[PDB]
Amino acid sequence: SIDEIYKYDKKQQQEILAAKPWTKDHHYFKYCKISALALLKMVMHARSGGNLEVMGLMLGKVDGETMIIMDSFALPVEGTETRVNAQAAAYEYMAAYIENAKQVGRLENAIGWYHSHPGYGCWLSGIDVSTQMLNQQFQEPFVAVVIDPTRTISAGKVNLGAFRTYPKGYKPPDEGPSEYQTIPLNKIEDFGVHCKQYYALEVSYFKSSLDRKLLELLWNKYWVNTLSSSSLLTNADYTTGQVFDLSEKLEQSEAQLGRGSEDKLAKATRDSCKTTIEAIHGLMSQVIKDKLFNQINI
């Protein structure tokens, strides 16, 4: 039975809460299972606001080293990324939402907070790290999630991240590859400083029996939306912007060759591909359609 996870054992939670394998090992939690609903609503919350970062709250539970996220919702706050802990404005709508939600079915407890990062990867800024450190300080099992809606679109797949911060004192172990994503230079500094102070979590996605069976029945009529998709005028103001970012990254490495952070043409080359790889992939689905619907004759 797939619905092993949509079950919620409440007494098991409060035994782990008391036991605490997180006060013993600093990097205990390493995995993160994201539900069907949780993914959709978080992606929907990020894009709905769009250009502006907005954060909400996640609900979930713990199991082994996996911090499972079951359900999510929004926090009507402002100044995400510009304020350290911007959720303080609506302390009312955190507890008041879970008090209402527990009457109707959502028994799940506070598991974390998520925010959107439109057009610049998934990572924790210096403002985000100060939020999460103090979140872990008091309100324990709390995981900071990030999603990039504008690139999720252009890249053509779920652009998402799940992170946890380390203590101010103890410093991380060695094993860390960490994959590269284009960071706009305006932000590269902020990232660059506080980037090594935290560690990510291995993301995995699950679903129920009904969800799985519904999505299969849903696909009978959803193939139509795939071949009238067109990721061009949808996210037009990411690709047109990335150019502005790309231009600056070259401008630096050009003068770097001259008189005068290690070969910033190798980054810019990867960015020029990254951004254009998308632009080309876009025109694949376009010609695919011109082939299909236009070329039948009468």
Binding site: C273, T276, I280, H281, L283, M284, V287
Partner: protein, 173 residues
């Protein structure tokens, strides 16, 4: 149509067969074929390579070079005068008739895009035909025509995915 594949053969026999100097009829066709495919630079330096021996003996070759002068000068009525002059049958007379046709549609495709309005008499001589045949030839096309002033008014005239996937995989590495 097939003059292309045949011109190739002439150019080869220039360096192929002879110790230096090619056949006199082979010179007569190489000059006229360069004019057919409007290559006046090639036609100019071909004429200067000919030895004075074949030049003087083969006086019909001069009649073909007299055509090339008018293409360089762009005296279009002069071209049609010099095409209707020397009968060099078998060898050159077939490619002389094709030469007059390529020069005609050049001067039509030219005049069409070079003139909003133009004199019928000039237009006639520029393409070669007389006043009537010129006035008629255009009225079939639907070109506007003007009496009194005699002014013709010209009307101006996987495959794809394979290419794309490469430009991805290239930039992708």
């Amino acid at each position: 149509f097939s003059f292309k594949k045949l011109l190739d053969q002439c150019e080869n026999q220039e360096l192929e067969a002879p110790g230096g100097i090619a056949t006199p009829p082979v010179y007569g066709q190489l000059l006229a074929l360069y004019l057919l495919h409007n290559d006046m630079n090639n036609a100019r330096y071909l004429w200067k390579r000919i030895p004075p021996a074949i030049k003087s003996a083969n006086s019909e070759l001069g009649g073909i070079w007299s055509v090339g002068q008018r293409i360089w000068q762009r005296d279009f009525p002069g071209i049609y005068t010099t095409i209707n002059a020397h009968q060099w049958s078998e060898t050159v007379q077939p490619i002389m008739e094709a030469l007059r046709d390529a020069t005609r549609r050049r001067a039509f495709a030219l005049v069409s895009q070079a003139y909003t309005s133009i004199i019928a008499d000039d237009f006639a001589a520029f393409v070669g035909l007389p006043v009537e045949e010129a006035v008629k030839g255009i009225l079939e096309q639907g070109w506007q025509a003007d009496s009194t002033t005699r002014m013709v008014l010209p009307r101006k005239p996987e495959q794809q995915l394979a290419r794309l996937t490469d430009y991805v995989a290239f930039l992708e590495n």
